[PDB]
Amino acid sequence: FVNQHLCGSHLVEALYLVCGERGFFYTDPTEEGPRRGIVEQCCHSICSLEQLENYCN
Q: Is 50 within 8 Å of 18 (Cβ atoms)?
């Protein structure tokens, strides 16, 4: 993951990386539109890693 399009769990992964085992908030890829912030921003556009670190716990 390096400031590049990240959708589906390909995004979760990053969060997993930066969040580590501490567990990251993202639920499942389906069910319903996730946070509606990181996804619509990192999937349709690029996003920061510092932005994933606030997702961990």
A: no
Name 56's bridge partners: 24
Which of 53, 40, 37, 36 lies closest to 1, judged by CA? 53
CA distances from 16 to 7, 34 (A): 14, 15
User: Total domain count for the chain?
Assistant: 1
Quote the domain boundaries for residue 49. Answer: 1-57
Elucidated via: NMR
Task: Evaluate whether 37 touches 54 at the Cβ level (below 8 Å).
Answer: no
The CB density around residue 39, as the number of other CB atoms within 10 Å, is 18
